UniProtKB/Swiss-Prot annotation, chains A, B:
Enzyme Commission designation: 3.6.1.1
Cofactor: Mn(2+)
One of the record's GO cellular component terms: cytoplasm
Protein name, entry field: Probable manganese-dependent inorganic pyrophosphatase
Family of the protein in this entry: Belongs to the PPase class C family.
Bound cofactor: record note: Binds 2 manganese ions per subunit.
Classification via InterPro entries: DDH_dom, DHH_sf, DHHA2, DHHA2_dom_sf, Mn-dep_inorganic_PyrPase, Oligoribo/pAp-PDE_c-di-AMP_PDE
UniProt binding sites for Mn(2+) 2: 14, 75, 97, 149
Any matching Pfam family: DHHA2
């Protein structure tokens, strides 16, 4: 009866932070909940965990294997993004900031979705609404989740209310927003220590675009050209992944967080549709896409339009 | 920019109350929201609107027709229970206490689902959470929804937090909980004014139970015996429906909403799948199903299990 609280596959900072923050809150409310992760923390999240001196959630792969019948999803609701046997257990709660799709429950449940910058932002309000004090380290993982998802509040996903949230969490966490923000974001640009295969699967999701299974990965870097130093291995890793997972197209978003621009490297059957989604020309399989920092707002939408559905 | 707020087709008290109350709330929050209905009030709801003297929402049939592109749904989420052009508009918010299915959004949205007795109960908390004092008449329709969906807090669907809510909405609406409730519930048991075919179809559903097509209807009455005065005319309307709709089994629930029992009348090929389902014996085509007041929580399972899985 231990309720498992977890974010999406290829957990990012917001996924981990929101699940940890929410699990703690559930416990304060008398619920036997435990935060777990569907994968190992990425470099950005590792930085956060280390910073506030807390351990990463246990990594699990099957709810049933862990003997759990009830789960709480944070930072996602779509089944392909959840635990492998999500269809076999009961989803009792969901706290997320994404559109809803490929989600279904047999019974009523709790749901708190808000079209804001991060799932962590929502959990924060739940602490306030329940009158539960926020511990320093919990504030830290929540703040980190918000900072992560909004690129230190500079991303188009930043909601009007997020800055105030970010400000209060920073205070509770004992950090200077800009200083901590920049340090953490930079921690995610540690890509050299990763293999090409791992690099393209650090932060990636799949989208069904008018019948095409399109993989869209993102990475934060201090320089697009640095990431391209291994373009060959990366393209190779991309083609391999495409064959292994059934992807007709693979889009790699190389985001320069300093200059707020992203390089688009795409391979597959419909690279021409990619070129159409952004009106550019892929040379050696990539092109510059100025001002792009958000996958959900500045990439998927145009890819959706060009592929159509 | 004009958001319609509505409950589900064939609205009950909760559907009407929750949309009216919530729409009012959004307006106090600066959102140009308007409560609309997908049908006219039933005897129960007409009794409520009159008691607190307020007009029932205007019945509409299309969001596109009302000049609205955005909509807020209360007391439901499944598209088949919604507005005709639901897939054509944007769902900006959902307040409900049902399971989720046949629901999808292209973009992020606000969702507030809680596994409680009524949708009105959730709206109640939304008022307090937003610092908006609840208006007398509004408390009236909200209280009615809660009392209606939970049979004056007696149903298995009643949540631990529902009583206090019911209690507080009564105080605000200026009524005594126990009297207004009974008086309101009794007011809605008007069956003699409807034809047999109408009864067996005012609140029924269909369930595929291993190849069988079983109709399961529910009628609220203050006295089963009285409805049993029309047994014959009923079995006729039943046999008829089974002929026209292919139904292999028809189970009628004559729910006595004051004692919490439901006499089960069954005609069909598997009138044994039912007995073995409620461990009773159909003496005259019907048996006594004590404690039954909820179809899915007290009738579906056993049926679902007797027909085996
Ligand atoms: Mg992201
Ligand atoms: Mg009901
Ligand atoms: Mn995430
Ligand atoms: Mn997120
Ligand atoms: Mn309803
Ligand atoms: Mn309801």
């Amino acid at each position: 009866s231990k309720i498992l609280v977890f974010g999406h596959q290829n957990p990012d900072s917001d996924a981990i932070g929101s699940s940890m923050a929410y699990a703690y809150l559930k416990r304060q409310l008398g619920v036997d909940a435990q935060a777990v992760a569907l994968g190992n923390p990425n470099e950005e999240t590792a930085f956060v965990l280390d910073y506030f001196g807390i351990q990463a959630p246990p990594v699990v792969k099957s709810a049933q294997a862990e003997g759990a019948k009830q789960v709480i999803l944070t930072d996602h609701n779509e089944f392909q993004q959840s635990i492998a046997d999500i269809r076999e257990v009961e989803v009792v709660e969901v706290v997320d900031h994404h559109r809803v799709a490929n989600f279904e429950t047999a019974n009523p449940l709790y749901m708190r979705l808000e079209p804001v910058g991060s799932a962590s932002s929502i959990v924060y309000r739940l602490y306030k609404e329940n009158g539960v004090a926020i511990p320093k380290e919990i504030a830290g993982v929540m703040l980190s989740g918000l900072i992560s998802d909004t690129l230190l509040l500079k991303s188009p996903t930043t909601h009007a209310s997020d800055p105030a949230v970010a400000e209060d969490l920073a205070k509770i966490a004992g950090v200077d927003l800009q200083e901590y923000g920049l340090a953490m974001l930079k921690a995610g640009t540690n890509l050299a220590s990763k293999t090409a295969a791992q690099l393209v699967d650090i932060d990636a999701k799949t989208f069904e675009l008018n019948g095409s299974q399109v993989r869209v990965a993102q990475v934060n870097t201090v320089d697009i050209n640095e990431v391209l130093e291994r373009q060959n291995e990366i393209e190779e890793a991309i083609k391999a992944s495409q064959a292994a997972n059934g992807y007709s197209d693979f889009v790699l978003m190389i985001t320069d967080i300093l200059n707020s621009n992203s390089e688009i490297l795409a391979l597959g059957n419909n690279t021409d549709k990619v070129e159409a989604a952004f009106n550019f020309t892929l040379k050696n399989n990539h092109a510059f896409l100025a001002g792009a920092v958000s996958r959900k707002k500045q990439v998927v939408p145009q890819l959706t339009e060009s592929f159509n559905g």
